[PDB]
Amino acid sequence: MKIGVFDSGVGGFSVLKSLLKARLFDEIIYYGDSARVPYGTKDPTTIKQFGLEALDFFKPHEIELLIVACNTASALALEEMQKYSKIPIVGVIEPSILAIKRQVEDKNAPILVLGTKATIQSNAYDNALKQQGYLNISHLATSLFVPLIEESILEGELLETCMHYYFTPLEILPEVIILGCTHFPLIAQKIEGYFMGHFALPTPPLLIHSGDAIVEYLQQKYALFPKVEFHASGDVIWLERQAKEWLKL
Amino acid sequence: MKIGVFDSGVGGFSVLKSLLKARLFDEIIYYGDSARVPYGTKDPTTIKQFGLEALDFFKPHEIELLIVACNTASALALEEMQKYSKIPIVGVIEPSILAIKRQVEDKNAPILVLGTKATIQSNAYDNALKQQGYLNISHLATSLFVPLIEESILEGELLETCMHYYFTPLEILPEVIILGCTHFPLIAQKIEGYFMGHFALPTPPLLIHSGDAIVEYLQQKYAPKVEFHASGDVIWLERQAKEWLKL
Ligand SMILES: N[C@H](CCC(=O)O)C(=O)O
Ligand SMILES: N[C@H](CCC(=O)O)C(=O)O
Numbered sequence: 137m138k139i140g141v142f143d144s145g146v147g148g149f150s151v152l153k154s155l156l157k158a159r160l161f162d163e164i165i166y167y168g169d170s171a172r173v174p175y176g177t178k179d180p181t182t183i184k185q186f187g188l189e190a191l192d193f194f195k196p197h198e199i200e201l202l203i204v205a206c207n208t209a210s211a212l213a214l215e216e217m218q219k220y221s222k223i224p225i226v227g228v229i230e231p232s233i234l235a236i237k238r239q240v241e242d243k244n245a246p247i248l249v250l251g252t253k254a255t256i257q258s259n260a261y262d263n264a265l266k267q268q269g270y271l272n273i274s275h276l277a278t279s280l281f282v283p284l285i286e287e288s289i290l291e292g293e294l295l296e297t298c299m300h301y302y303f304t305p306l307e308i309l310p311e312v313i314i315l316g317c318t319h320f321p322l323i324a325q326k327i328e329g330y331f332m333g334h335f336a337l338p339t340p341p342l343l344i345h346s347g348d349a350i351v352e353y354l355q356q357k358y359a360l361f362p363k364v365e366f367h368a369s370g371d372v373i374w375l376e377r378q379a380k381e382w383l384k385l
Numbered sequence: 386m387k388i389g390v391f392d393s394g395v396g397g398f399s400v401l402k403s404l405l406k407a408r409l410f411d412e413i414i415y416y417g418d419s420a421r422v423p424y425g426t427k428d429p430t431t432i433k434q435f436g437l438e439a440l441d442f443f444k445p446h447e448i449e450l451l452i453v454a455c456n457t458a459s460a461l462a463l464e465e466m467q468k469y470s471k472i473p474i475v476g477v478i479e480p481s482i483l484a485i486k487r488q489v490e491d492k493n494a495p496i497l498v499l500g501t502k503a504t505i506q507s508n509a510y511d512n513a514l515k516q517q518g519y520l521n522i523s524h525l526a527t528s529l530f531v532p533l534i535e536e537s538i539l540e541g542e543l544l545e546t547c548m549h550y551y552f553t554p555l556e557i558l559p560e561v562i563i564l565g566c567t568h569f570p571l572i573a574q575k576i577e578g579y580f581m582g583h584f585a586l587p588t589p590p591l592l593i594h595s596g597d598a599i600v601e602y603l604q605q606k607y608a609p610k611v612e613f614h615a616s617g618d619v620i621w622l623e624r625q626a627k628e629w630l631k632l
Contacts, residue, residue, distance in 0.1 A: 177535070182618065279532070286426070
């Protein structure tokens with residue numbers, strides 16, 4: 137097929153990478169609203185309007201299916217968007233819950249949800265999880281991880297001090313951690329390392345990657361080479377430059 | 386005297402606070418583009434457009450003077466705005482340079498400019514400083530300071546470690562530090578302490594507060610009902626003001 141991938145900026149590249157890795161589609165129209173990014177710190181009303189406007193961007197491209205790669209957008213604007221689209225719009229939250237259900241049998245396993253303040257406050261992960269029968273659910277808005285990852289601070293004392301800042305107030309010891317944000321996969325190993333150490337874990341907690349989850353899901357739902365076209369709200373060449381580092385083979 | 390104050394979001398309150406205090410105005414229409422903030426990490430073209438669209442917002446409020454409280458906008462779109470503008474537009478850069486000439490005679494004094502990537506990248510401060518004679522100039526895009534302050538990390542090891550991340554590479558020990566960003570005034574005390582405690586400096590480096598600087602300048606040119614506006618939830622924005630303006 138020919139699809140569109142939407143995100144607030146360059147975070148969506150973590151989804152795009154999984155999409156390319158799988159060779160699921162022949163044409164992908166990537167669009168990042170890099171001029172208004174980030175969404176996670178904004179309000180619900182606003183993100184919803186951004187959502188609608190994103191649809192308008194794809195009207196001329198005529199895609200068969202739109203993937204809302206942004207977790208913040210999937211959480212607060214996927215419904216309204218789907219409500220005005222003729223084509224199917226798949227967010228990243230839904231696929232992750234299927235991913236969890238498929239590999240976590242113990243309904244008591246401690247699950248920690250990570251994401252932006254907007255994502256967390258919408259409680260989209262918690263509701264979908266509870267509905268599926270999970271009883272031990274925690275959530276944390278790790279805002280600073282986004283700007284940190286964007287400055288490319290993927291190691292060192294600043295990241296460690298930042299992770300320590302958000303994690304220390306943690307009560308539960310998670311067996312599952314949801315990277316409910318486009319950025320978090322770039323520091324997934326650092327997060328695993330933090331919990332493995334601070335809790336003398338034998339193995340790292342299971343990490344749920346949004347990109348990998350959507351892919352599996354898309355292969356499932358549509359029993360399934362890769363040519364991308366980049367579009368941005370802000371300087372597009374600036375965005376294309378990021379793809380190089382994020383998508384890194 | 387009715388004036389509009391423009392900023393990327395809530396950082397502009399630090400200029401507002403310096404304004405209100407001086408009280409030389411009887412009406413201020415504050416407009417923060419909170420839905421698109423920050424400007425500091427974006428490109429010149431986008432920022433120029435944003436600044437232009439900001440004018441389209443004060444047309445109705447019919448203000449006499451427009452203060453661009455944002456250092457990034459000042460650096461990247463002031464010229465463009467002043468061009469298509471009917472009324473005078475004063476940014477926060479030039480006033481900070483006049484305040485520097487006025488307070489620093491040693492044209493060799495080590496000067497460090499701190500601002501967003503865009504502000505630093507534009508060389509607005511280095512250029513203006515050089516046309517005035519200074520030869521000891523250094524600049525640092527201390528990007529993360531904005532999101533940290535936005536999240537109120539104004540103390541603690543996270544802030545401390547961030548300052549260390551940006552400052553340790555610093556070649557010259559600054560005698561003058563320019564808070565070339567609306568958020569930096571909130572960690573001024575902490576920034577002074579850093580170098581002070583890090584080099585046993587009895588006296589803290591001189592810090593230039595953009596807000597104060599534009600006030601002194603506005604004092605010479607000689608020219609309160611504050612009205613908050615925003616591109617994002619106006620509720621969330623004004624709430625913030627309570628803390629920034631808080632005194
Ligand atoms: N794309 C957002 C992170 C960046 C932003 O806040 O816009 C998400 O996945 O939640
Ligand atoms: N107001 C901006 C900082 C925040 C932003 O980047 O929008 C400045 O003074 O540079």
